[PDB]
Amino acid sequence: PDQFRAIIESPEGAGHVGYQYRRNTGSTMRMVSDVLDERVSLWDFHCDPSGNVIQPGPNVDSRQYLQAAIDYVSSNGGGTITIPAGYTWYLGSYGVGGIAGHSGIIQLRSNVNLNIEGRIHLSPFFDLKPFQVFVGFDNGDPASSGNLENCHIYGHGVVDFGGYEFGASSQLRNGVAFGRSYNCSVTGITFQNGDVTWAITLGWNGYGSNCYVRKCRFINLVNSSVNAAHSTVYVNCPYSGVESCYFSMSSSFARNIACSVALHQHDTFYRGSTVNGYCRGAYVVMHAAEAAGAGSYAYNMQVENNIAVIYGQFVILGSDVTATVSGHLNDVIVSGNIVSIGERAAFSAPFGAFIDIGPDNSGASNVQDIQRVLVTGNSFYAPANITDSAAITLRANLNGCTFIANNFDCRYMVYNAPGTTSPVVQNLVWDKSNVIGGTHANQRAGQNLFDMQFASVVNSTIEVQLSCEDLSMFSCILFPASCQLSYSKITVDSAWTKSMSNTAVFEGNQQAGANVYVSYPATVNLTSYNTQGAVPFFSTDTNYAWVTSAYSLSINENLDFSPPATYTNKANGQLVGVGYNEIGGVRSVSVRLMLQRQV
Amino acid sequence: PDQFRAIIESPEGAGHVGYQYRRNTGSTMRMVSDVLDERVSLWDFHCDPSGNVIQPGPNVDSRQYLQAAIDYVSSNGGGTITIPAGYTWYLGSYGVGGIAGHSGIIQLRSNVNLNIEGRIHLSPFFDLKPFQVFVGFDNGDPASSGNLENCHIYGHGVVDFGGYEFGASSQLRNGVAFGRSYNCSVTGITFQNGDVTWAITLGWNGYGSNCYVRKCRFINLVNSSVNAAHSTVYVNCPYSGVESCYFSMSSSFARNIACSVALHQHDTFYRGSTVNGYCRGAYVVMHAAEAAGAGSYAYNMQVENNIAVIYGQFVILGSDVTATVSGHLNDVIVSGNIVSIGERAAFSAPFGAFIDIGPDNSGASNVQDIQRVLVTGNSFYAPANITDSAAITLRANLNGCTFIANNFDCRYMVYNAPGTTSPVVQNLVWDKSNVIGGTHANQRAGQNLFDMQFASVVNSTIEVQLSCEDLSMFSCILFPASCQLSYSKITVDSAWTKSMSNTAVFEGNQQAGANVYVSYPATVNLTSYNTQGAVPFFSTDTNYAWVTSAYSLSINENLDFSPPATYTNKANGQLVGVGYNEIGGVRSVSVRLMLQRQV
């Protein structure tokens, strides 16, 4: 009767108004409320205890309402909650329960997706405090946490950290901590305007799978000297990665502390992304302390087709150990990336490198087990003034890394600082197809292009090929006497080297070793016997006991004689060859030779 | 009057309740039903004949209801049907009509997209039977089938095959058979828990275009010995591909039968994906029998930037013929992939390879027309115990394949089994920039690193470069007498070769051919005349009629004389050079030479 009017204006009203899709007689006879129940938004929970809707804004703490939404949808097996466009939804307090320990604001739950179309902002309650905006753990102790599965965050919206600085270096801040996370992702979202430790973390100590970050943007997420460290996406579960993202920082501190991506477990990737203003591109590291979920090996690591302007190192390789676990890194590919060091003074940020073999956190360089790394088809450029730029800074033990078909245009090709660490190196392979650029030509006074400041080098190949002159460099490659060298191949192509005083330098005459295979140019003075006809020439110096053959790199300006085209040696360390005196007489010549040993 | 109450509670109720968007006076005056009619879900068709909604579950066959939805939406020009989250929708019977012949469950229709947010499960009715869950053909005979256009399946949902094994090897099972499919795709879906032939097939015998699989997951889709074969996504129309997917198998049988992707037509790709537990990565094959829609050539084939742990072959190249059509494969690129053979006993699965040139289905090796393949910037690794691992197993005729700047770390570089097929090889190019790894060092007793077990080799380049010692190997490269060799270049760099008895071996002295260009190290015994002064040395053996020049790779321990630095030959097959006797006397020496022919 008039009871009907009352029902209709009541909350159950829509449950009494019939609907059948497109008047189709074969369709289900439903009620309007049933169709509206097919979707869900924050508006459906953003109300006071009387059920009246509350408008969001800077004086409203939306946290409890969003939590209620997620908890309720979780209760029905999942779904997608929309965070509506055209509004900014402020968060103003910590969550409670299991996420309390993680300084969590919102607890994510399995199968409950968030479609963020509007903006989520942190209120000043969080200034100078830690926070983790979305947390997937359900326990304060991550080891007793259940899992988070099938949770996807996506949309055109924004998460804005409100510009608040850290209160103390020891604090952590995150956007999305997925936890022990399986089939979770973040797509399309802009994370901005903060001072945080990470924007997103996938996995927890190897527990997790199939977590991805795609088409997101990360903008100005470090802003203070208080911030101890930053990796925008931290990939800590296997079969997981970052694809087609954009990362930008503009603070000075970001140039010293910030890394775009950290890959910490097997079968992870970082691809198709653009970085600007960061210290570092990617960490690729097996931390023993994070090896509980997916084992002790980081393998199948891929960094590909990225574009970066950074201030420190592009890719940092590592592994370490704990009292009970030893970490290992292997089967890595770095390819297709175009990377430059941004304009900066020499030494004004961490040492510029395409690849860095870094020591562990405690600075130890003798714990690493890094091998089967392929670095291929990349471009790297540093401005000419940046003394501290290298294709590779090899500062810790290396068990293998292979470079093929790259283009490196920076100050050093291989570098480690002297005095410092003395890395044990095996299976360092520098193929002849690496092109060494000319930007730093004339800047290398006192310096060695490949500065082999290592404890030892074995089973390695360095094939140096210049593509322009740099007569400022001390040598193309130098081994100090402290570096053992064995079962290696070291060659310097003669092109652009004719005027170099030193090409390859072995300060402990390591090139004499039984299984060292070398070649490089040198200038040699020779004197002949006086005999007319076929006549020997002999080097005046006796430094060539290790030489198997040598050949001329100089023309013969003489008519009446010619020096030998090719030389061998003698037991006293002289070179000897057979030339020709048309007319007799003692000859004396200075010739550029290619010295060869076992090659 | 009270007629109004009745209208409102009726199915037409919502068609009588007015709505205007946001009270905007300029907006359309509509009825609620009009706005609800903008979307459509399974709920709108999942009802009994009285229009009452039916709850899904393991005792409800949702098939007819989903079919009705698709048929109805098809009738209005298309749209997107949501399969709601928070529910599992069981399928319990075969479809009828044109898809009956394809063992179809559901018939897809043009412009009707499915947004799968919940789960679709197969009921036990399908145990031991064939099925194809979604079928795009409209006729039992595919040749008389109409097309499927603009059909997209996407969402966060799941298709679960219920774990049922095949009933017989001859049965086929599929998830999505798109048919003659144009502008169709599958995005975001998890396919799991089955024993099937394929998860998705795109195209039919070259008919189709612009079909894609992106961000899907494929998990445990082979589970029995009954399963004859499996390719997770079968790409059988052009301008189509797979991108950023995840594939995983855990059964033993998958290691022997399962391939992640099959590319069978032109302008197809497979990229950015991760594979674990499969026998094979990708087939790239032009089957003559499937050449009706897009011609007889598979060209523009791309496999790039994938990550794989497999048990057999990463990329399998092929082509075959029928009585009226000859298949051809050309213009292929395989690049950026990092691939390893998983831990397994030698010979316990199909022979491990990065690239396999396979014979056709009937085993024929003389029908293939494969050329212009570029294999570049890949990494490959097999554990040291896996005897049956090769960069390339070349088991059928090859008309060209080019390898540049890869890193191969496995047992063989080039291999084919002896006795077996005798492939005719042209335009095999192995650039010097391929890095040969050391994992298998010391495992190669009795074996040849490049084992050229072919009928003939022409217009080919093998430039061998070691980066560590392996003195266990019989030779770096060996050609049996049965292999003709012409118009080729074969070189073995001397590095790490000084102690090798055999470097390159030509069992029929094929290196003597007019247009063979070779170089490799050998040890040679020489004896000099007694003359004081310039004095010839001559090899004691007469095996060097083919040598154009040789040079020393050994130092000269003597003071009183030196052997020649360089040698040529004589008509009787001796080497001859001019050295120097400071003091006269017959000299006799054993020297490591680099033997050179026309290089």
Added chain:
Amino acid sequence: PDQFRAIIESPEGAGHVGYQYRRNTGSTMRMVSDVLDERVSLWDFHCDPSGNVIQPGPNVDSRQYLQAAIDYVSSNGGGTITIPAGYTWYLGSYGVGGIAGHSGIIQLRSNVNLNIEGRIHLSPFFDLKPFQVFVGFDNGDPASSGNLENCHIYGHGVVDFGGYEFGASSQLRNGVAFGRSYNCSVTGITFQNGDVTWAITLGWNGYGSNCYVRKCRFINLVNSSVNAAHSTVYVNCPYSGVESCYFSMSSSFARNIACSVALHQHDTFYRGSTVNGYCRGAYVVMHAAEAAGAGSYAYNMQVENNIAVIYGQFVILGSDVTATVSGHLNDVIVSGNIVSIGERAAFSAPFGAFIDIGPDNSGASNVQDIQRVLVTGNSFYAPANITDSAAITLRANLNGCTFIANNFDCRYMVYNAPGTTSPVVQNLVWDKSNVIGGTHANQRAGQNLFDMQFASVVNSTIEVQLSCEDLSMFSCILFPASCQLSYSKITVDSAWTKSMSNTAVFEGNQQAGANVYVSYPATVNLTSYNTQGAVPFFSTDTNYAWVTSAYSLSINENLDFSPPATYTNKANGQLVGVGYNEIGGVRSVSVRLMLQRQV
């Protein structure tokens, strides 16, 4: 009372019918209209002035209705307007206001996304006229335009240009002109059936950021001889790109005028896409005239992992200047692409090339500043008949370009037409790892594989390596006398060269320069003195004053003597070496040597 009935049938009806999500007592007590207000479609504005809905179709101009939708949603802070599936929405007039100057139809507005599920078609009103379907400028003068931010167009729908030809060459036509566009994108849309200048343009004269085109299709967008030019996506703001798109043309005119992508600002990319039927793949060019928003440098340019069949040039590099600005292009990577020239007569379209260094629009070749380009791991193929095919056509000044590990199979490796431009070349690097294919073998009568038709060449490397014979070619590499050559390395590997009359040719004897490093094969006639024993041989010609060493590439058919293995030279330009007469007598021989200078 009966007033209630009236309210309910009124437009405010739904605002009086209560709803609470899933009967959840903790949910907001809302009205149906509130839930319907969460989404918005064209239907909500596609009405007459009385509020009655209008059906779209070929006689209805939907433009004003769509504009009203966008303007209204803009007014509320944004949202997403759906263009419904199952309908075609015709556009039939120009927009008004700021977009009038841009021949705009619809004005886009910030934060207002369009989800296009149905089809948008142009009505014949636009035949022979300019148009820009969606425009993001808000002023006729782009320089006084505000920005467009956070505008995304996406869905499964279509934009169809109605097949109308241009009315005049000077007209412009576009699909989406985003304007000064920040965080804008287009995803999933099919653009088809037109004669336009561009489908999408991102940015305006460097103003914009983070604009992307992904998973779109572009089909048959040039159709007349009237069309002056076409670039399907024009990327004119930084941090922007195209990914995973499909481009196809079928008209003849497209083969001559159409380019798939133009990258015109820094930190832009083009990846994962497939092209067929176009003249050109991508422009990578810094236009001085478009350098207002993001500076004068195009750097971090990436073209990767694309598949193309084109008729002209794959990647075109450029830079130019204006009276006040000089453009610069640097830090470019082209990698992983597989590209072929489609079947066509020689010279029937613009000259086929993988890379083209093009002159500016006015044809000037002396304004360019292009450097630090890496071209690596690509494949290129042209059919044997296409005389006009080159790895690189270098037609303008070049300051650096590096080629590593590619596979080029076309007519020329390096080419520029003689007579024409005389490019100044620096830092051209052609690594030995580039594989030169054999398709054009026997087609090269009168031609030079590397035809160095330049003003000068400095700091360059050309390492030629053949992998099959082509005895038709005039030379492997030729420098005309007009080309200066200095501080370079030029080498021709001897493999497959034994029968070549000319290998490297220096028409002005440029190989004699102080800092030229060269090697190549030649045939040389020698004569010996009659002396028994060690005996000199001397070349009969005096053309070898520049030779530092030479070595034999021929066997010695003689028993009674041997020519020298190795040679040096003399001041008169003869070669000289020491061989051996077992028996005395004057010897005369023709030998294939490897001539070497400073290498």
